Every structure is written in C-alpha cells, then in structure tokens.
C-alpha cells in the first residue's frame, strides 16, 4: 500500500500479499529520447481502488458538482499524463520495468 500514485491510483497491492516482485532498469529496448506516446499516468480517481482489480475504463475527471458532456475547459481535467522521460536523465528518473 504505502502512499503515492502507486497502489492508490495505479495498481494496488493487496493486504497480506504473497509473491515476489522484480524491478530492473530499462534505459534501452523501447525507451528512447523524448516523451514516448505510451507510458502515461493513471491518476484522478474518485475512489482509492481495490486489490487485484484493473481499471481500463477512461473518462474525463470531475472537479466540480456539475459534470461536462464532452467539452474540455473549466474543471473536467484530464486524468492522464504522458511520462516525460529520456535515456539521459539521472538515477531517479530512468524508466524501470517492474514484474
């Protein structure tokens, strides 16, 4: 669980979770300079999510009592954001694959 975007709006680790996790740096092999098209944020959730569930449904986030009908502008902010990474960052910004 912990805090942050991980396990709150991203994939949530269940309570009393059993299993291993392996993380490794991904400087190359489908990680090039500039902002790649994929690999975007999953934020702006009204709930705290549930263990083991996958959220595939994307929708305009609600920032007010009245919800918009498909127009972007005041409120109705985007719940996603691309990762502005690059293979020329430091140690804390390089892409990392977690399985």
């Amino acid at each position, epitope marked *: 669980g912990q805090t942050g975007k991980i396990a709150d709006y991203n994939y949530k680790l269940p309570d009393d979770f059993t299993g291993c996790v392996i993380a490794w740096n991904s400087n190359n092999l489908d990680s090039k300079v500039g902002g*790649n098209y994929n690999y975007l944020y999953r934020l702006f959730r009204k709930s705290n999510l549930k263990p083991f569930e996958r959220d595939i449904s994307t929708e305009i986030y609600q920032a007010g009592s009245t919800p918009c009908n498909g127009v972007e502008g005041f409120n109705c902010y985007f719940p996603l954001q691309s990762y502005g990474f690059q293979p020329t960052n430091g140690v804390g910004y390089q892409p990392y694959r977690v399985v």
Partner: antibody, heavy 126, light 107 residues
Framework: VQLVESGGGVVQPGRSLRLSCAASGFTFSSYAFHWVRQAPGKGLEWVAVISYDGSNQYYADSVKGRFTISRDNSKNTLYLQMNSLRADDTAVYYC????????????????????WGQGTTVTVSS | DIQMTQSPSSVSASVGDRVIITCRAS??????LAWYQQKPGKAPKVLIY???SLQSGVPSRFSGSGYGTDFTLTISSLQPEDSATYYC?????????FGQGTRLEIK
C-alpha cells in the same frame, strides 16, 4: 503553409555561406526545424537540427564542428552558416519541420517530417 | 550508429500488382519509423507516421506495419502515379541515417 529557401551559389570554395529559410502559414515559435540535404542524384541526408527554443542543436559526424544553425522568431526566419567548404559539398539543401504529436496534452517532437520547402541547390567547384 | 537497409532495389509493377517494401534496422527501434514517398524531382512527402499509423491525406492503399528490427510497407494497388522512391527514417537517437531507397517501375 509555405517554406521558402535562399542562399544558392555558383561556386563557394572554402568560403562563407549564409543560407536563409523562412516559415510562414504556421507558428514558427512552436516548432523545431531541420536542415535536410540531398546529393545530386543520391539519397537523402540530414546535416543540422534546431530545437524549438534554440537551445539544442545537433549535426552529423562529418558536419558537426564546421557548420552552424540559428533561428529568429522576430522575423520568423532561420539561418544556416556554411564554412570550411570542400569540393565535395555539392548538394540540395532543404529546410523542413518536425512532427509534434499530442498525446494526453503532451507534444512529442523529433518523430518525422511533415512539410518540405522547395529547397536550394548549393554547389562547389575548383 | 544505427544502420538500416531497405529492400528490394528496383522492381516493376503496375495496375493491379501488390508490392512489399521491407525495412530492416540494425537495432530495435520499436514503432519509431516514418515511410516517405519522394518523387524523382520533388521533395519527399510523408506517408506513414509512427510506423503503423497513416498520415491524414494519404490514400488508404498504402499500409505500414512492423516493429523493432523489421518493418513493412505494402501497396495492394499501384495506380500509375506512385512512380517514385520510398524511404524509411530512424529517430531513436542522434544522428539520423537514411537508407538507399526503393524504386518502382511500370509493367
């Protein structure tokens, strides 16, 4: 949109050249630019790039250290400085624009070519 | 440096003939490729962006598909106006290096 280039020369043996390409019909300050050459009958080559803000400029292995690029948003026009000219520098230089793809509100550059100008053929002799 | 080869060299096909152009990159450049159609005396025009998508204004006949090492540009119908050359473009990292190019003839 309309890309116009100028700065041709009958002969430029080891001389100074100031090529100029202008961008009109689209925002000059919101896009990066490329200088892409082409040999007289051969394939396509790239010699110089300029970033959106002018901070990042990169050249080829045999082009870096001798040629220069620059841009100006007041006139919406950009320039190429050509020095240390040999007899094998005859080519057809073009001034082109990148592709800015919007994903989740973020603009991605340095992905391809969209608009090409007429181009200017620069030749050298002895 | 990244070196890429475009095949074949020169073939002839007209009217209802399907042609395939293969683009093999030394490194795995993922879905980062653009296919252009440069006329013999005109500036190149982009036909494929993102190596899988089709640029707006390009006819639907041209198709592109591939990833990593291998890419493919397929044309089912060659109407007598595509008499030009086709080029790839790799942009994973600087510098930019282009291939030889493929030319099509009319039978």
């Amino acid at each position: 949109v309309q890309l116009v280039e100028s700065g041709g020369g009958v002969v430029q043996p080891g001389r100074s050249l100031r090529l100029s390409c202008a961008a009109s019909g689209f925002t000059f300050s919101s896009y990066a630019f490329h200088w892409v050459r082409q040999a007289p009958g051969k394939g396509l080559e790239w010699v110089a790039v300029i970033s959106y803000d002018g901070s990042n400029q990169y050249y080829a292995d045999s082009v870096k250290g001798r040629f220069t690029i620059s841009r100006d948003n007041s006139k919406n026009t950009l320039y190429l400085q050509m020095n240390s000219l040999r007899a094998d520098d005859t080519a057809v230089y073009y001034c082109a624009r990148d592709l800015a793809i919007a994903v989740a509100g973020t603009w991605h550059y340095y992905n391809g070519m969209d608009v090409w100008g007429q181009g200017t053929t620069v030749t050298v002799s002895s | 440096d990244i070196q890429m080869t475009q095949s074949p060299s020169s073939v002839s096909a007209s009217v209802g003939d399907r042609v395939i152009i293969t683009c093999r990159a030394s490194q795995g450049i993922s879905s980062w490729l653009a296919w252009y159609q440069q006329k013999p005396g005109k500036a190149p025009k982009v036909l494929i962006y993102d190596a899988s998508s089709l640029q707006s204004g390009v006819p639907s006949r041209f198709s592109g598909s591939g990833y990593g090492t291998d890419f493919t540009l397929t044309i089912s119908s060659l109407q007598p106006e595509d008499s030009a050359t086709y080029y790839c473009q790799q942009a994973k990292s600087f510098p930019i290096t282009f291939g030889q190019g493929t030319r099509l003839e009319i039978k």
